[PDB]
Design a protein around this motif. Structure first.
Motif, PDB file in Angstrom:
ATOM      1  N   UNK A  56       0.845  -1.223   0.000  1.00  0.00           N
ATOM      2  CA  UNK A  56       0.000   0.000   0.000  1.00  0.00           C
ATOM      3  C   UNK A  56       0.861   1.246   0.000  1.00  0.00           C
ATOM      4  N   UNK A  57       0.344   2.226  -0.710  1.00  0.00           N
ATOM      5  CA  UNK A  57       0.936   3.567  -0.811  1.00  0.00           C
ATOM      6  C   UNK A  57       0.706   4.265   0.526  1.00  0.00           C
ATOM      7  N   UNK A  58       1.766   4.845   1.062  1.00  0.00           N
ATOM      8  CA  UNK A  58       1.763   5.519   2.374  1.00  0.00           C
ATOM      9  C   UNK A  58       0.650   6.572   2.450  1.00  0.00           C
ATOM     10  N   UNK A  59       0.601   7.494   1.490  1.00  0.00           N
ATOM     11  CA  UNK A  59      -0.434   8.553   1.540  1.00  0.00           C
ATOM     12  C   UNK A  59      -1.833   7.911   1.613  1.00  0.00           C
ATOM     13  N   UNK A  60      -2.081   6.803   0.911  1.00  0.00           N
ATOM     14  CA  UNK A  60      -3.401   6.126   0.996  1.00  0.00           C
ATOM     15  C   UNK A  60      -3.601   5.486   2.375  1.00  0.00           C
ATOM     16  N   UNK A  61      -2.531   4.909   2.951  1.00  0.00           N
ATOM     17  CA  UNK A  61      -2.644   4.284   4.287  1.00  0.00           C
ATOM     18  C   UNK A  61      -3.015   5.364   5.294  1.00  0.00           C
ATOM     19  N   UNK A  62      -2.381   6.525   5.180  1.00  0.00           N
ATOM     20  CA  UNK A  62      -2.684   7.653   6.088  1.00  0.00           C
ATOM     21  C   UNK A  62      -4.152   8.069   5.871  1.00  0.00           C
ATOM     22  N   UNK A  63      -4.611   8.054   4.629  1.00  0.00           N
ATOM     23  CA  UNK A  63      -6.012   8.512   4.388  1.00  0.00           C
ATOM     24  C   UNK A  63      -7.013   7.572   5.049  1.00  0.00           C
ATOM     25  N   UNK A  64      -6.788   6.260   4.926  1.00  0.00           N
ATOM     26  CA  UNK A  64      -7.747   5.316   5.545  1.00  0.00           C
ATOM     27  C   UNK A  64      -7.646   5.400   7.068  1.00  0.00           C
ATOM     28  N   UNK A  65      -6.429   5.694   7.558  1.00  0.00           N
ATOM     29  CA  UNK A  65      -6.299   5.880   9.006  1.00  0.00           C
ATOM     30  C   UNK A  65      -7.010   7.162   9.468  1.00  0.00           C
ATOM     31  N   UNK A  66      -6.957   8.190   8.647  1.00  0.00           N
ATOM     32  CA  UNK A  66      -7.633   9.483   8.966  1.00  0.00           C
ATOM     33  C   UNK A  66      -9.169   9.304   8.891  1.00  0.00           C
ATOM     34  N   UNK A  67      -9.620   8.594   7.877  1.00  0.00           N
ATOM     35  CA  UNK A  67     -11.085   8.393   7.660  1.00  0.00           C
ATOM     36  C   UNK A  67     -11.640   7.370   8.646  1.00  0.00           C
ATOM     37  N   UNK A  68     -10.845   6.338   8.995  1.00  0.00           N
ATOM     38  CA  UNK A  68     -11.357   5.272   9.851  1.00  0.00           C
ATOM     39  C   UNK A  68     -11.802   5.761  11.215  1.00  0.00           C
ATOM     40  N   UNK A  69     -12.932   5.260  11.681  1.00  0.00           N
ATOM     41  CA  UNK A  69     -13.466   5.643  13.000  1.00  0.00           C
ATOM     42  C   UNK A  69     -13.065   4.616  14.072  1.00  0.00           C
ATOM     43  N   UNK A  70     -12.911   3.382  13.624  1.00  0.00           N
ATOM     44  CA  UNK A  70     -12.580   2.273  14.534  1.00  0.00           C
ATOM     45  C   UNK A  70     -11.762   1.265  13.783  1.00  0.00           C
ATOM     46  N   UNK A  71     -10.773   0.703  14.509  1.00  0.00           N
ATOM     47  CA  UNK A  71      -9.819  -0.263  13.896  1.00  0.00           C
ATOM     48  C   UNK A  71      -9.818  -1.645  14.549  1.00  0.00           C
ATOM     49  N   UNK A  72      -9.936  -2.646  13.711  1.00  0.00           N
ATOM     50  CA  UNK A  72      -9.711  -4.031  14.206  1.00  0.00           C
ATOM     51  C   UNK A  72      -8.241  -4.315  13.915  1.00  0.00           C
ATOM     52  N   UNK A  73      -7.493  -4.486  14.996  1.00  0.00           N
ATOM     53  CA  UNK A  73      -6.041  -4.804  14.871  1.00  0.00           C
ATOM     54  C   UNK A  73      -5.878  -6.313  15.035  1.00  0.00           C
ATOM     55  N   UNK A  74      -5.655  -6.964  13.913  1.00  0.00           N
ATOM     56  CA  UNK A  74      -5.687  -8.438  13.862  1.00  0.00           C
ATOM     57  C   UNK A  74      -4.257  -9.012  13.828  1.00  0.00           C
ATOM     58  N   UNK A  75      -4.125 -10.014  14.662  1.00  0.00           N
ATOM     59  CA  UNK A  75      -2.925 -10.909  14.647  1.00  0.00           C
ATOM     60  C   UNK A  75      -3.463 -12.350  14.552  1.00  0.00           C
ATOM     61  N   UNK A  76      -2.589 -13.294  14.169  1.00  0.00           N
ATOM     62  CA  UNK A  76      -2.973 -14.712  14.187  1.00  0.00           C
ATOM     63  C   UNK A  76      -2.304 -15.343  15.418  1.00  0.00           C
TER      64      UNK A  76
END
Ligand SMILES: N[C@H]1CC[C@@H](N2CCCCCN3/C(=N/S(=O)(=O)c4cnc(N[C@H]5CCNC5)c(c4)C2=O)Sc2c(Cl)ccc(O)c23)CC1
Ligand SMILES: Nc1nc2c(ncn2[C@@H]2O[C@H](COP(=O)(O)OP(=O)(O)NP(=O)(O)O)[C@@H](O)[C@H]2O)c(=O)[nH]1
Ligand SMILES: [Co+2]
Ligand SMILES: [Co+2]
Ligand SMILES: [Mg+2]
Length: 162
Positions: A56-76
């Protein structure tokens, strides 16, 4: 109708796409996009808008992080690097949001597997240090999948009352 922008993040192969497709299709999957689902949680109807991200492109990752209201942080649960990498996803989200307080749920996926390398207690204690809920899920058997996403919506609602 209240809308919630949810983002599923985590390392490669932890099950981000499988968790999302299980919530949407009720099916275990055998391209990163967004999915929509109207649900009732606690007697309130809302629309979930879910973005499945890549491990993923950094600027796009920052945008989804800026837009996102809640994050599921997944590990296995059979992948120690994926668990250690939760620090990095959390750090990146808090940096973009410029806040210590971001609705997040820690998810340990593949709970059905007998090859566990991450103890439930270890992940519980980390989630307590972060002040966020921790849930173990199986995208394969659907165990706790709705609980993970609905707990994330409840965290966003609790945040909005602050
Ligand atoms: N449908 C095509 C064109 C859009 C593509 N896409 C991903 C879907 C974007 C959905 C809109 N959106 C967002 N749009 S965006 O911020 O401009 C954006 C962020 N990342 C994107 N793709 C990355 C995530 C998947 N891996 C690369 C795309 C659009 C991005 O470029 S952010 C977002 C969040 Cl936070 C939650 C729910 C969302 O629906 C949402 C998917 C393929
Ligand atoms: N046993 C088991 N396997 C699972 C589970 N969830 C995902 N898998 C398997 O794990 C592999 C990777 O799953 P996938 O959903 O692609 O993960 P991802 O995190 O979206 N991958 P990526 O970052 O590349 O996009 C697949 O073989 C999938 O079947 C689960 O709960 N249990
Ligand atoms: Co099938
Ligand atoms: Co760091
Ligand atoms: Mg995927």
């Amino acid at each position: 109708m209240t809308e919630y922008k949810l983002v599923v993040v985590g390392a490669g192969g932890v099950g981000k796409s499988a968790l999302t497709i299980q919530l949407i299709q009720n099916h275990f999957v055998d391209i990163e996009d967004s999915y929509r689902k109207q649900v009732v949680i606690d007697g309130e109807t809302c629309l979930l808008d879910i973005l499945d991200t890549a491990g993923e492109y950094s600027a796009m990752r920052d945008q989804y992080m800026r837009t996102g209201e809640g994050f599921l942080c997944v590990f296995a649960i059979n992948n120690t690097k994926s668990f250690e990498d939760i620090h990095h996803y959390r750090e990146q989200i808090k940096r973009v949001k410029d806040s210590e307080d971001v609705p997040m749920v820690l998810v340990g996926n593949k709970s059905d597997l007998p090859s566990r390398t991450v103890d439930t207690k270890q992940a519980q204690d980390l989630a307590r240090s972060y002040g966020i809920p921790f849930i173990e899920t199986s995208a394969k058997t659907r165990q706790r999948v709705e609980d993970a996403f609905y707990t994330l919506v409840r965290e966003i609602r609790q945040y909005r009352l602050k």
